[PDB]
Amino acid sequence: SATLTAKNLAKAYKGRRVVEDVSLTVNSGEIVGLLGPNGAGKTTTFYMVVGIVPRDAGNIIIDDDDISLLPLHARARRGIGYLPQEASIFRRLSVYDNLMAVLQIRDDLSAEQREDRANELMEEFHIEHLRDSMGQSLSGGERRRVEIARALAANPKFILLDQPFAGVDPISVIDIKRIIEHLRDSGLGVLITDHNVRETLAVCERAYIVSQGHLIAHGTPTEILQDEHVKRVYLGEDFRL
Ligand SMILES: Nc1ncnc2c1ncn2[C@@H]1O[C@H](COP(=O)(O)OP(=O)(O)OP(=O)(O)O)[C@@H](O)[C@H]1O
Numbered sequence: 001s002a003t004l005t006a007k008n009l010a011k012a013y014k015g016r017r018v019v020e021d022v023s024l025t026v027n028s029g030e031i032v033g034l035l036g037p038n039g040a041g042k043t044t045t046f047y048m049v050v051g052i053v054p055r056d057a058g059n060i061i062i063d064d065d066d067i068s069l070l071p072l073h074a075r076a077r078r079g080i081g082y083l084p085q086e087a088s089i090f091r092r093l094s095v096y097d098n099l100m101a102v103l104q105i106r107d108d109l110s111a112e113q114r115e116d117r118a119n120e121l122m123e124e125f126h127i128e129h130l131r132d133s134m135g136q137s138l139s140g141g142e143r144r145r146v147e148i149a150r151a152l153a154a155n156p157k158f159i160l161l162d163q164p165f166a167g168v169d170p171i172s173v174i175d176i177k178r179i180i181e182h183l184r185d186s187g188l189g190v191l192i193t194d195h196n197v198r199e200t201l202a203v204c205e206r207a208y209i210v211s212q213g214h215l216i217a218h219g220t221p222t223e224i225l226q227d228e229h230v231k232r233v234y235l236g237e238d239f240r241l
Pocket residue numbers: 013014018036037038039040041042043044045
């Protein structure tokens with residue numbers, strides 16, 4: 001029953017406070033959403049949890065252990081993983097090599113197990129037919145599947161998915177949701193942000209809504225979708241699920 005908690009995170013860039021105050025929690029076995037308008041601070045919040053950027057204030061805690069001082073690699077070894085929003089594939093490496101590149105980092109895997117895991121990931125994500133294709137040759141949706149698989153290959157306890165559905169077709173969204181639910185069933189805590197509101201809320205048990213660097217709402221999917229404030233500020237007053 002691990003718990004990942006962020007308290008009162010803040011970030012400024014060149015005097016502009018882009019994250020004012022964001023707190024959130026994700027438990028093992030739980031899928032949690034972070035949603036909101038563009039420029040609201042979602043990726044910056046993920047960056048601060050993962051350790052990609054230093055926070056200007058706030059705390060990152062796993063269980064009753066403040067890890068705010070741990071560098072990126074140490075937080076990764078404590079169980080935090082991140083799927084970047086931006087392209088993260090190795091352009092010149094094949095799909096197989098891209099997955100092996102991450103599996104090589106796994107102290108908890110033998111050489112034989114790494115090869116097995118690579119082949120399993122390719123089947124689960126339906127990219128076996130692209131085994132030898134270079135990353136730069138993949139379409140956007142194909143690349144995204146590889147990038148999600150790479151993030152899972154790290155075997156995180158808490159996985160932060162930054163826009164896993166971007167550029168993905170509807171059937172592949174269903175496949176990825178099913179994979180996400182299997183991670184949840186397996187004990188992972190999942191923190192997901194995406195602008196496909198319907199499909200993200202369908203897979204979330206609860207979600208935080210941020211706007212202009214601050215939280216404006218938190219609740220179950222239906223509580224969010226019927227929140228008239230969220231409709232006005234984020235979903236649009238005429239939003240239909
Ligand atoms: N390195 C930076 N320097 C200055 N400003 C930045 C920097 N990075 C981000 N910003 C600004 O911080 C604000 C929040 O950025 P962030 O990417 O975290 O928001 P977001 O919620 O993820 O947006 P989106 O939904 O469009 O992806 C933005 O307005 C951005 O212009």
